[PDB]
Amino acid sequence: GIVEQCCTSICSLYQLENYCN
Amino acid sequence: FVNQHLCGSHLVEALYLVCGERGFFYTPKT
Ligand SMILES: [Co+2]
Numbered sequence: 049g050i051v052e053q054c055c056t057s058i059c060s061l062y063q064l065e066n067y068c069n
Numbered sequence: 070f071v072n073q074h075l076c077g078s079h080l081v082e083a084l085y086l087v088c089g090e091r092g093f094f095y096t097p098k099t
Contacts, residue, residue: 051097055076061087062070067096068088
């Protein structure tokens with residue numbers, strides 16, 4: 049998932065925004 | 070904004086900055 053992707057690959061702030069409440 | 074390579078606690082710092090007041094869920098794989 050996001051956690052893993054940001055660490056093994058890369059991720060954007062826009063992807064991270066999906067985990068906001 | 071630039072793309073991110075974020076592991077461990079560095080990810081939840083990023084989540085904190087992105088989301089601010091909104092809060093967030095930190096949901097790693099088991
Ligand atoms: Co470190």
